Design a binder for this molecule. Sequence first.
Ligand SMILES: O=c1ccn([C@@H]2O[C@H](COP(=O)(O)NP(=O)(O)OP(=O)(O)O)[C@@H](O)[C@H]2O)c(=O)[nH]1
Ligand SMILES: [Mg+2]
Ligand SMILES: [Mg+2]
Ligand code: NA
Length: 327
Amino acid sequence: MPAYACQRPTPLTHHNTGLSEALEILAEAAGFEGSEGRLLTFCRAASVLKALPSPVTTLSQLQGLPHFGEHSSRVVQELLEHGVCEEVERVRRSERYQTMKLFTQIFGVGVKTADRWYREGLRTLDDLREQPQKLTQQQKAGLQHHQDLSTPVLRSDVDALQQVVEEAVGQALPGATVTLTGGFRRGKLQGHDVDFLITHPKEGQEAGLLPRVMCRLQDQGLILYHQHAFERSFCIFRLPQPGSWKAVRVDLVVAPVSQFPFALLSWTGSKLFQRELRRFSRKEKGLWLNSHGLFDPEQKTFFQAASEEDIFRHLGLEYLPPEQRNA
DNA sequence: CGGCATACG
DNA sequence: CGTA
DNA sequence: GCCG
Ligand SMILES: O=c1ccn([C@@H]2O[C@H](COP(=O)(O)NP(=O)(O)OP(=O)(O)O)[C@@H](O)[C@H]2O)c(=O)[nH]1
Ligand SMILES: [Mg+2]
Ligand SMILES: [Mg+2]
Ligand code: NA
């Protein structure tokens, strides 16, 4: 078992679901406390279990696995012996965890804002609604739409949305393309949002595109919220339902076609997979990876990629299709 | 011990 | 600060 | 919290 998540296939469904979920609770709680290192270790340990070919049934099966030390092994031990880990259950029922989870789930609220509201004594969404002077416009939208945004987006919703985005994109710039990315490209059946990547086959034609797309979507009455030169938009869309509609989060990103493989890789995820890939690139290969390219700081040169396959090959990694990037 | 991904709005 |  |  290799130490980096980008070195091994990780399928969406696997054989250690309960164990990984418990470790991910501890990872999330570490993040609420501002402990990024402990969040990463618990996330990486959970992801190792997702990559295993069969269920862990005995503690000895953790020997030699990366990211399993005394703490993560003790968590697994208690789950195997008792079906429950006392530390995990203590986190689950704690007021701090439940409130931080509730607040950070709001669009426009991160850990730092949630923590400040917690320290001020706020605990519920209605507590926030009662003091709307203290909310940004983005947070007001996140709070108004919170119920709809808490409902999973279905894969059967996604095609209809892609069609309306393609219509606006085609008027904004004929020949521009829309690619589904994010969790749905990795095979998820649900999601918290829909992520799209937009480009055009002629380099440079995509400049200035996203404002033109957003104006057209807004003119069609489909935009419940957006931030408005820009190349990423984090919106709330009106999605039709039987006799009504629901609010859905939609992310749009524009990239020049020269950068498209890097952008597709970056926005397809998973989040942990991309952090691990960027860490691998820098620490093992001495190359700097982001959503725009792959930089050799010694030569001061960028690697020209025509595909995701190119990028894996340039990093010396076996290719993983999106469905195996569910770290 | 240092390090923990990276950038845009 | 938020967001991906 | 764990790795190198
Ligand atoms: O902090 C982040 C968040 C997101 N991303 C990249 O953006 C992609 C989309 O980010 P996302 O937040 O839409 N997550 P996703 O995997 O689609 O699952 P869901 O919760 O169902 O929407 C992720 O899969 C990562 O590739 C990052 O690189 N860093
Ligand atoms: Mg998504
Ligand atoms: Mg997204
Ligand atoms: Na949030």
